[PDB]
Design a protein around this nucleic acid. Structure first.
Ligand SMILES: [Mg+2]
Lengths: 53, 343, 101, 127, 103, 52, 13, 181, 112, 18, 56, 209, 188, 346
RNA sequence: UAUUUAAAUAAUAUUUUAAAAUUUAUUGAAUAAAUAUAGUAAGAUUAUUUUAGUUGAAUUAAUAAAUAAAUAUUUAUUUUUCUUUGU
């Protein structure tokens, strides 16, 4: 409860600079956040080049 | 026939029907056409993500050393390794943290692994040693019996001079060192391919089979024969680890599909041979180790045949406790003289 | 005719059919035997050109080193010069003055 | 030549002749004269003086042959008659090893120069 | 190729998308675009099936059929056999002799 | 002694004492004169011990 | 049916 | 490379050097339990051209000082008869060595000399190193620069150098110690 | 690895007894052949009649063989029905035969 | 005679009776 | 009979440890696994109860 | 090499290039990218292993194929010298016996010790396997695993001082029949050696107290 | 006969060897601690094996659940033969390690009274660069390359050919690569 | 028997003789677009004889006599200009050689004009050769350096660096030549076939081109005083060399002599997957397209996406025990219903 | 007596058909056992398209003499020279 009320947004692990994320793991982690994660753009979205949501 | 043989290409017509099918056959459009199964690398198993789903934080990529995390997530509780982490001659030399799952297909927290157990980079020689030993041990040695000339009573009926015999067949002896090395390398190969999943408990609400099937359906565990199999390592949980299996899950895991539960250990007993010089004549069984490895152990053959590898935190703790003294003894002296200093 | 299954070599030139011996420039059996004998004799003479050098107890063949050592280990306990043990086995006498001698 | 004895075959091998119908070019040294005198019944020899050779090949007269021999590379096919095919094989292997060592030494010298430049730049940035 | 017209019309290639034998799939992935860009006139008929016949078939402009066996054969060899197919006309078969030098 | 003196002259400052010791040992093995072997041992000590 | 069955052979010294 | 026997025969050396012409100079032999470093071969290695800088022999050799200390303690570098010392590390800190060489449990170096077909008691020997980690090919190229004429193969686990004896294993150990492993 | 396990005894190869081999080589029994469908040297391999050799088959199709000989009534319950394995299940479709119509291979009911 | 080669089973009598 | 490491037999953590098992197979179905566990437990119980009955 | 872009070389292949089977994943590829190891057929043993023996090792003839010329064959009869024994000269009867027991006859009481190098002991102590504070004994050696159990045999050991010229610290060790040089080196260092010659039962009690 | 505790045995006692004032050297006893851990694990395992209880999950073998998996005679023999000896070995290891800890404390006090606090702290430290390597490789990536996969080390990470990848949806969420292939050589 | 080669001996067929296609730039990218991005911050001609003349001319240029090389290049360039159409490969290449000859003779303005003409022809070229464009821009850089524009020279040099880092494949030149050491079946003699090596400075000339390019860039940086640029160039050059060596890497197979098994060369030499293409098209990043309409297996959700059939009746799972007795059938009774409950839809 | 360098502790097997009558018993020359063993007579011994050496030598029963030669498997010495050379 503490960590969920502290962190509403995904941390630096939600990055595509090295490899593609796994949709199964994203669907599993969906419940821990408020914003949808499984919605993935066709472009390898990076933390620095574009702001996430 | 053989490639460099005249009998290789004397079937010069008729192998194909000139008229194509009207349901499945199609024409090649061009370079922008995506052919089903086409891949530049030779992939005898062309399984992809959708067909064989991998469960990991990231898809295994050449940029990432391992598909799992590299630093603890600030929004998830991090659990350090039960025993302290040491990097040996074969360890990946990088921190590995796995996102432990729950029975409701939800990530609970993140637990750090052991590079000595899940960081020993795999090697084909050791994997092949393990596979060959397993495939030569699992064969039935009691069915290798054959007749002989002194056993045939009145050529065609007369048996051979040196026939195959259950006692004459060989059962090899494998040392615990190479066994543990191959098992660790196989675990690391599964981790690198990204098909390792860590669960807190493996417990069914009822010991029946329909509850097991409902659990597998709820957590998207493919158990069918045709689909990718599952290899369980049940050890209890993190707080209450148990060497034996949970009774309910052990009763419910008896399904016709491809799911196998194995003991939570990577070592083995030292195989002995009391009939090395053929002293006891009336002994029945193959020569060599009279104490082979049982079936419910972790092995390269079953690990390759079963797609997903689901290890429990109790199994993790037991493996770490069993490999602690080994990874401490392997260390060179100028390193091991500092273990009591660092604690 | 000691080997009764002759080797069949790959035929790169048609004259390899007409030729019988594999290495024509190589001398025949007895000739190369006596040639090697003469060469070994010349090498042995070059080796024995200088006098037969005498070796200490450590630089001896194993069947004589330990015997020569145990024949004098009794006197080696008392450090005094002028102590010789005339042992049977050892380097024979050359019979002529030697610079190493 | 293989029809004759092993000694005449040895002499022809020294003269660099193996089969019937092969032609070679040799100097007029006393050794070659002796070899040709020994095998004079199996080979036919023609004589060409130095000026006749300079006319037969399109080389000017103000250029000698010592300079041409010093200019032609020594890496020619089968440069030296080694005393054993094992020696031949290890000579070729050492040649390949020298090529590989040339490449890796070029790379390592590049690395050394880059490291020295980095060290000098870091020292200058400190001072 | 006679008077500017290719003799080979169709190239039948059967393969499997999931079973195994990655040689034909390697060929379809690596050398098939090159071959199709070189000879766009010939029609490549791809046939996906469960148990594929490890053979390539060439159907020419006169009904003739020429098949090559490509079981566990490298994609380079597959491409070579395909080029041999598109190179030959498959209209006759005469030996190489002094009497057969001139047709 | 010529070979050992060339090695001593072409040695590395951190290697001079070891080569001097090797020279002294080879002299004693060769049965060089006692003054020669004592001079070589003294030179080895000179190159080894800083205070000496 | 049934005849003299062969047993395991003892090894040498 | 002086032929003492030939010099004595020709009259260039005193006749008392026959023991030198017959038996080699007595030196403590390098062993897996007694690291008897050889200054001559170490100087030869220092003179040979290599990309990586080697430590000085003064630092490679264990310290030899006064032994008046009443009680001994656990210093990393202390007086040892067999010459055992922890790895000193790289010579220049501003560098990156592409490979890493782990020691064994007893602190011995990976160099192990085997024999080809040892059932026939064959004198032909070869060396196997199966503790190198990192970029094995850089280590292989350094071994090429060390032994130019030898055949050096590499695999995922072991690097083989053919036709080298303990006389080459000691050179390999010297180079490893000079590098700092 | 002390005397690594033999690769020839891996249970994958079972050739005819030859003059070469090892003491631990499991050759075929006397009076029996290696390949089951090799009745003669020219015996063609059966089309779809598979014999599950070695371990127990995960999915035993009713037309396959396992410790049994080919009995028509036991291996073919209905000749017009073709059994396949789809989604780890025995699916029994109608049997079709290929016929050449309009230059393409159309599927017609095999029994009819 | 090599009696150690056999195991301890009584062979059937020849000729076998009806 | 002969010599057999009875001190080793029964020492392993589980029942399947320290038993000469050379009649298994590389693939075991659900019934095969159940029968394997049944046979191991039955072998252990048979040994124990037969020894107890004999000594009593 | 093509001279122009308009006229490229044909694609007709030779036998060497055409007759090439598919590529199998080797150890280098499986170690480089472990994503390819998907089946048990990928776990190939050491490339040093060629395979099963496919030919006959015929003596004086080399290695022959199966079904070849069995005419000039003697290895079969060999598996089923007279020119040296022609003069009736047995080697086992030429030379006489030095003694009824023979040279190096290991009789009960010969006291054949197992070598233990003082250099090895010093290496172990500097390594840390053995603690120099406690008195050194065969039990401590066996437990520190400085010597395997295979080398142990009555009588226990001999302390050989090979390649050692100076011991820097005093060592208190208990062994059997230590060499004079080892004893004097330990005495010079300041340690105290005590030759403990044990019987068989005493040695067994020392090894398993 | 007490050769296990580290002191001289009865043979040395009879010989009269003066080895009591021998020396006081610091010792980490890491190997002894490893062996003590092994012995403790073995003692616990021996107790668990001795305390085995029949737990049969099948009805055929259900008439044993209350009994021990051992015959009481063999259980007594096991207790007297192996379980009771493992404890003696554990006690031997503990006694040796405690003696060495006492000597270590004495050496620490002596160093503190002779040199000083920080001097003794530095003299009784075994830290080495390779120790930092073995314990934390992130503080060693710059010093040397010790990874089994050297091509992924950050020093040599430039060699890995990072491709231009894209997830197509028309294929069912499939990641493919955008750059074209290379034309491979075909013939001579 | 040792060969003397005194007679004519034809060469042997070896896999290193495989013709390799020249690297082509993609169709979408253009050299003029790249240059603008960088600026932001046939009739019958005796071609055999003209090729003889061009070879003699380049021999002259290599020997040092530059004016004769220039006139040879001019003759053969007139020939090629008359023969080939607008913007052709040999045309632009021979005019590159002509500009190089002009610069080596001293006519630097004409050299720069010719090289700018090469640039404007590469503009219109559809798929220019990677090696040709690299050598052309290296020529322009060296001409600028000779004129005195060292900034523009090192700019062109880093342009070559960028082009060859972006649109070049490094592992193609050693595709078929890396597994050649596995052809070694003899160890005592002829064992150089186990140590065969092919220097990368010969089989892909673009690599040597950029090597000399970055070498000249390093010299210019050392002359100017841009230590940062020198360090950058040396780092990039070392990285390129390491990439090439890694793509050339391979493990050693069998070492000792291996008698027989002559049919192993089929496995030895083949379409060997180079490490570059391995790490590029790894099966987890280059996910294959596997459509289920042609298969009989699919995930739990996509059951109806298998190949369709006529009157598909799901009987049961192929439990091989169903052929046994009534007891076994009672054992497997519930299995079908439990499996249906498992694979029920959402 | 011990002042000299290493090491992958693993054993089990080894053609086939035959070249001979003595054995151990039983029923009035036959019957049933013996892969028993013949310095061992003779034959048969399953797998193309291959990739490197010799084509008639050696031959000393027996005290301190450099060395037997062929055939075959592995394996090692890149030093000079006008060319050549399987040690
Ligand atoms: Mg020979």
């Amino acid at each position: 409860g503490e960590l969920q009320k502290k962190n509403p947004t995904p941390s630096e692990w939600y990055d595509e600079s090295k490899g593609p994320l796994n949709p199964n793991f994203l669907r599993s982690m969906r419940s821990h956040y408020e914003v949808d994660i499984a919605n993935l753009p066709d472009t390898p979205l990076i933390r620095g080049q574009r702001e996430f949501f | 026939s053989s490639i460099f043989s005249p009998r290789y290409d004397w079937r010069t017509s008729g192998v194909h029907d000139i008229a194509p099918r009207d349901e499945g056959d199609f024409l090649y459009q061009g370079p922008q056409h995506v052919l089903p199964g086409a891949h530049p690398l030779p992939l005898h198993h062309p399984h992809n993500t959708i067909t064989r789903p991998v469960i990991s934080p990231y898809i295994p990529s050449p940029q990432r050393s391992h598909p799992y995390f590299t630093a603890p997530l600030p929004e998830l509780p991090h659990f350090s390794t039960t025993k302290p982490i040491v990097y040996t001659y074969g360890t990946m030399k990088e921190r590995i943290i796995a996102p432990v799952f729950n029975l409701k297909n939800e990530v609970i927290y993140t637990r750090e692994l052991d590079p000595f157990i899940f960081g020993m980079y795999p090697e084909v020689e050791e994997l092949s040693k393990n596979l060959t030993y397993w495939m030569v041990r699992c064969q039935n040695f009691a069915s290798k019996w054959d007749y002989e000339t002194r056993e045939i009573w009145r050529y065609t009926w007369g048996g051979r001079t040196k026939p195959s015999k259950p006692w004459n067949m060989l059962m090899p002896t494998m040392d615990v060192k190479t066994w543990s090395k191959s098992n660790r390398m196989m675990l690391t190969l599964k981790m690198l391919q990204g098909r390792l999943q860590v669960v807190d408990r493996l417990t069914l609400e009822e010991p029946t089979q329909e509850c097991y099937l409902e659990l597998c359906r709820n957590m998207s565990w493919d158990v069918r024969h045709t689909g990718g199999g599952v290899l369980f390592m049940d050890g209890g949980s993190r707080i209450t680890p148990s060497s034996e299996f949970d009774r309910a899950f052990f009763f419910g895991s008896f399904f016709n599909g491809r799911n196998k539960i194995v003991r939570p250990t990577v070592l083995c007993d030292e195989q002995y041979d009391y009939n090395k010089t053929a002293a006891k004549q009336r002994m029945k069984g193959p020569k060599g180790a009279k104490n082979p490895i049982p079936i419910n152990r972790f092995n390269a053959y079953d690990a390759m045949k079963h797609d997903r590898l689901v290890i429990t935190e109790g199994a993790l703790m037991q493996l770490e406790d069993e490999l602690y003294e080994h990874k401490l003894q392997i260390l060179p002296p100028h390193i091991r003289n500092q273990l009591p200093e660092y604690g | 005719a000691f080997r009764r299954l002759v080797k069949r070599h790959k035929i790169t030139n048609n004259q390899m059919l007409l030729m019988r011996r594999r290495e024509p420039y190589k001398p025949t059996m007895k000739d190369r035997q006596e040639i090697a004998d003469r060469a070994k004799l010349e090498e042995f003479e070059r080796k024995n050109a200088d006098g037969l050098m005498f070796v200490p107890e450590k630089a001896l063949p194993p069947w004589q080193k330990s015997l020569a050592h145990n024949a004098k280990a009794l006197g080696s306990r008392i450090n005094f010069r002028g102590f010789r043990v005339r042992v049977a086995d050892g380097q024979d006498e050359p019979g002529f003055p030697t610079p190493f001698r | 030549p293989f029809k004759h004895s092993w000694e005449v075959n040895r002499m022809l091998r020294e003269l660099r002749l193996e089969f019937k119908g092969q032609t070679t070019i040799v100097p007029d040294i006393p050794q070659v004269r002796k070899r040709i005198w020994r095998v004079r019944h199996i080979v036919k020899v023609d004589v060409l003086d130095l000026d006749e050779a300079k006319a037969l090949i399109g080389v000017p007269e103000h250029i000698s042959f010592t300079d041409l021999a010093s200019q032609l590379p020594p890496s020619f096919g089968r440069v030296k008659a080694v005393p054993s095919p094992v020696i031949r094989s290890k000579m070729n292997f050492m040649k390949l090893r020298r090529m590989r060592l040339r490449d890796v030494l070029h790379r390592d010298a590049l690395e050394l120069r880059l490291l020295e430049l980095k060290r000098s730049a870091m020292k200058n940035x400190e001072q | 190729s006679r008077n500017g017209e290719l003799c080979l019309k169709k190239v039948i290639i059967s393969y499997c998308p999931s079973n195994g034998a990655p040689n034909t799939r390697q060929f379809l992935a690596t050398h098939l675009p090159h071959f199709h860009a070189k000879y766009p006139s010939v029609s490549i008929d791809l046939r996906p099936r469960l148990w594929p016949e490890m053979a390539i078939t060439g159907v020419y402009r006169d009904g003739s059929e020429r098949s090559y066996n490509t079981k566990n054969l490298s994609p380079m060899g597959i491409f070579l056999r395909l080029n041999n197919l598109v190179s030959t006309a498959n209209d006759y078969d005469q030996p190489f002799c002094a009497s057969h030098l001139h047709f | 002694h010529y070979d050992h003196f060339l090695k001593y002259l072409n040695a590395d400052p951190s290697t001079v004492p070891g080569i001097a010791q090797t020279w002294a040992t080879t002299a004693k093995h060769m049965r060089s004169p006692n003054w020669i072997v004592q001079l070589l041992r003294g030179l080895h000590k000179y190159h080894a011990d800083a205070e000496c | 049916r049934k005849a003299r069955r062969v047993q395991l052979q003892p090894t040498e010294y | 490379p002086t032929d003492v026997a030939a010099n004595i025969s020709a009259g260039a050396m005193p006749p008392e050097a026959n023991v030198a012409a017959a038996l080699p100079v007595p030196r403590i032999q390098y062993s897996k339990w007694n690291r008897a470093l050889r200054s001559d071969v170490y100087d030869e290695l220092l003179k040979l051209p290599l990309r990586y800088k080697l430590h000085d022999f003064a630092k490679l050799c264990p310290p030899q000082r006064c032994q008046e200390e009443p009680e001994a303690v656990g210093v990393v570098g202390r007086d040892s008869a067999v010459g055992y010392l922890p790895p000193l590390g790289p010579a220049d800190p501003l560098d990156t060595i592409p490979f890493f060489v782990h020691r064994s449990s007893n602190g011995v170096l990976p160099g192990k000399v085997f024999s080809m077909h040892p059932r026939n008691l064959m004198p032909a020997f070869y060396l196997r190193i199966q503790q190198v980690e990192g970029d094995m090919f850089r280590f292989e190229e350094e071994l090429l620069k060390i032994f130019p004429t030898k055949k050096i193969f590499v695999r995922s686990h072991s690097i083989y150098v053919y036709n080298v004896a303990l006389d080459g294993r000691m050179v390999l150990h010297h180079w490893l110690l000079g590098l700092g492993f | 690895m002390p005397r690594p396990a033999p690769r020839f005894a891996m249970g994958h190869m079972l050739p005819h007894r030859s003059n070469v081999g090892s003491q631990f080589l499991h050759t075929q029994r006397h009076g029996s052949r290696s390949t089951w469908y090799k009745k003669h040297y020219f015996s063609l391999r059966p089309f779809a009649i598979q014999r599950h050799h070695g371990t127990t088959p995960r999915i035993l199709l009713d037309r396959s063989l396992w410790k049994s000989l080919w009995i028509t009534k036991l291996q073919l319950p209905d000749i017009n029905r073709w059994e396949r394995v789809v989604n780890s299940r025995r699916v029994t479709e109608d049997r079709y035969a290929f016929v050449e119509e309009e230059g393409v291979m159309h599927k017609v009911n095999w029994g009819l | 005679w090599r009696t150690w080669e056999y195991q301890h089973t009584r062979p059937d009598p020849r000729p076998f009776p009806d | 009979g002969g010599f057999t490491m009875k001190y080793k037999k029964g020492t392993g953590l589980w029942d399947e440890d320290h038993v000469n098992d050379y009649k298994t197979n590389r693939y075991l179905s659900a019934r095969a696994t159940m029968r394997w566990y049944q046979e191991m437990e039955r072998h252990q119980t048979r040994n124990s109860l037969n020894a107890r009955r004999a000594t009593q | 090499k093509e001279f122009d872009e308009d006229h490229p070389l044909p694609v007709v292949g030779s036998r060497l290039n055409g007759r090439t089977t598919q590529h199998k994943w080797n150890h280098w590829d499986q170690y480089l990218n472990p994503q390819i190891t998907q089946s048990i057929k990928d776990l190939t043993p050491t490339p040093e292993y060629v395979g099963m023996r496919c030919g006959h090792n015929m003596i004086k003839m080399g290695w022959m194929k199966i079904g070849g010329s069995w005419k000039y064959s003697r290895g079969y009869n060999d598996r089923r010298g007279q020119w040296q024994e022609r003069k009736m000269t047995p080697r086992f009867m030429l030379a006489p016996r030095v003694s009824a027991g023979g040279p190096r006859n290991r009789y009960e009481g010969k006291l054949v010790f197992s070598p233990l190098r003082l250099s090895k002991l010093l290496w172990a102590i500097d390594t840390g396997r053995i603690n120099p504070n406690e008195v050194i004994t065969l039990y401590h050696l066996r437990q520190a695993n400085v010597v395997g159990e295979r080398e142990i045999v009555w009588p226990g050991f001999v302390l050989i001082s090979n390649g050692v010229r100076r011991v820097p610290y005093p060592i208190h060790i208990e062994l059997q029949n230590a060499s004079a040089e080892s004893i004097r080196l330990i005495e010079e260092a300041g340690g105290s050696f005590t030759c403990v010659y044990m019987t068989h039962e005493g040695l067994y009690q020392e090894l398993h107290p | 006969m007490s050769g296990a505790f580290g002191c001289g045995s009865y043979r040395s006692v009879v010989a009269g060897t003066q080895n009591v004032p021998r020396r006081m050297t610091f010792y980490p006893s890491a190997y002894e601690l490893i062996q003590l851990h092994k012995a403790h694990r073995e003692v616990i395992r021996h107790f668990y094996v001795r305390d085995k209880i029949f737990d049969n999950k099948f009805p055929g073998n259900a008439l044993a659940n209350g009994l021990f998996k051992f015959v009481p005679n063999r259980r007594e023999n096991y207790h007297m033969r192996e379980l009771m000896e493992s404890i003696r070995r554990r006690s031997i290891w503990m006694h040796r390690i405690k003696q060495q800890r006492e000597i270590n404390a004495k050496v620490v006090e002596n160093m503190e009274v002779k040199y000083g606090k920080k001097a003794a702290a530095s003299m009784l430290c075994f830290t080495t660069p390779d120790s930092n390597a073995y314990f934390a490789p992130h503080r060693y990536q710059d010093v040397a390359n010790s990874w089994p996969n050297y091509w992924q080390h950050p020093s040599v990470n430039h060699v890995v050919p990072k491709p231009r990848w894209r997830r197509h949806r028309e294929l069912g969420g499939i990641t493919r690569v955008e750059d074209p292939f290379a034309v491979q050589a075909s013939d001579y | 028997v040792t060969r003397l080669y005194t007679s004519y001996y034809t060469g042997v067929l070896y896999p290193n003789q495989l013709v390799q296609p020249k690297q082509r730039l993609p169709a979408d990218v253009s050299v003029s677009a790249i240059l603008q991005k960088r600026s932001e911050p046939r009739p019958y001609v005796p071609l055999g004889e003209v090729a003889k003349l061009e070879l003699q001319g380049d021999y002259y240029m290599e020997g040092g006599m530059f004016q004769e090389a220039l006139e040879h290049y001019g003759v053969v360039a007139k020939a090629y200009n008359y023969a080939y159409p607008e913007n052709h490969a040999q045309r632009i290449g021979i005019r590159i050689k002509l500009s190089a000859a002009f610069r080596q003779t001293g006519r630097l303005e004409s050299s720069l004009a010719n090289i700018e003409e090469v640039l404007r022809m590469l503009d219109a070229s559809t798929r220019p050769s990677l090696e040709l464009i690299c050598e052309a821009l290296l020529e322009l850089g060296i001409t600028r350096e000779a004129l005195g524009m060292k900034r523009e020279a090192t700019e062109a040099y880093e342009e070559a660096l960028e082009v060859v880092n972006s649109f070049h494949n490094w592992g193609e030149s050693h595709r078929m030549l890396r597994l050649l050491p596995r052809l070694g079946r003899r160890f005592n003699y002829n064992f150089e076939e186990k140590f065969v090596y092919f220097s990368p400075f010969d089989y892909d000339r673009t690599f040597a081109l950029v090597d000399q390019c970055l070498e000249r860039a390093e010299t210019i940086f050392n002359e100017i005083g841009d230590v940062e640029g020198a360090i950058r160039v040396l780092q990039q050059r070392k990285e390129m060399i390491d990439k090439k060596f890694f793509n050339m890497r391979d493990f050693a197979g069998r070492i000792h002599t291996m008698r027989g098994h002559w049919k192993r060369r089929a496995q030895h030499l083949t379409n060997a997957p180079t490490p570059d293409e391995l790490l590029r098209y790894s099966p987890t990043i280059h996910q294959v397209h596997r459509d289920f309409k042609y298969e009989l297996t699919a995930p739990i959700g996509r059951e109806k996406e298998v190949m369709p059939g006529v009157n598909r009746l799901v009987l049961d799972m192929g439990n091989p025990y169903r052929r046994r007795g009534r007891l076994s059938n009672k054992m497997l009774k519930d299995a079908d219903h439990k499996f249906a409950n498992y694979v029920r839809q959402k």
